[PDB]
């Protein structure tokens, strides 16, 4: 079923984006005075922070490219999670039809 493949595909893709985002953030932030997003372990925690849109404020980019990377993370995360919500709807809508005969 498409909605399930998509969900899954969306999860593997998000994990890729997170990892690539941790890498790209450090590359972008290092070199900028006062920057804090400069070691991979925390950067990875930051990407998870961003994609889930929780945004604590303990870490965030300050360079143009860092922020640009941050926007791809947010958007991939929002889109990905929004797709799970959508696939859960197709499951419910499908099951609610069965329960009515159709």
């Amino acid at each position, epitope marked *: 079923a498409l909605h399930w493949r998509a969900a899954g595909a969306a999860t593997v893709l998000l994990v890729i984006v997170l990892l690539a985002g941790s890498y790209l953030a450090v590359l972008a932030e290092r*070199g900028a*005075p*006062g920057a804090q997003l*400069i070691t*991979y372990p925390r950067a990875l925690w930051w990407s998870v922070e961003t994609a889930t849109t929780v945004g604590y404020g303990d870490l965030c980019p300050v360079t143009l490219w860092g922020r640009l990377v941050a926007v791809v993370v947010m958007v991939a995360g929002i889109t990905s999670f929004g797709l799970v919500t959508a696939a859960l709807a197709t499951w419910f809508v499908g099951r609610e039809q069965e329960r009515r005969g159709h």
Partner: antibody
Amino acid sequence: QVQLQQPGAELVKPGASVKLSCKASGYTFTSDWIHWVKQRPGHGLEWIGEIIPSYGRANYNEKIQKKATLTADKSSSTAFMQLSSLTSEDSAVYYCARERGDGYFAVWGAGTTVTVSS
Amino acid sequence: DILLTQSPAILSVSPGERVSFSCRASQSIGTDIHWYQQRTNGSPRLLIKYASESISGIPSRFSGSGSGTDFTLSINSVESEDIANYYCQQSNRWPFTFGSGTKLEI
């Protein structure tokens, strides 16, 4: 085994330029950064800059005059520091170190003693 | 850019005694401080990372503690092999910076 190998010494004439090397062995990750640290006799450690080999980007210390230019050779696992127009101020021991992107210098090289004399 | 203050610059202690090295940051940096040892003629060698984490191949004698702006490197029961220069290094904010150093003396 010796993770970072550096030449023992380099002699340079005021104004001339030298190119120091740092050969790495052992585990190498795409998340590695090579650092260069300058130490004058009797004094402390001074960070010069860093290079991310797997990508090739370099950042430098903004407070001190920029006399360095970092490059790296992915194939031979060698990091290079290009010092130009050296003066007596630039004579010192230059160490290279490897950081795994977690902020601390895991291993340092024996360091190359540079001397700027005529 | 973060300034790491190391004072006193020299520390005199007697054999077997406990010694403590101080390192203060000009702003809060969590536990992003690392300690290096450097003997006469040798290159620096990581002693403690992240203010208090052990490194393999280093006498259980060495420990560290602190968080925020005040950090300590302690040697329980000093001994001649420990005579050297000690530096702290921070990785909280770019660029990484080093302390001016503290010389140990028996």
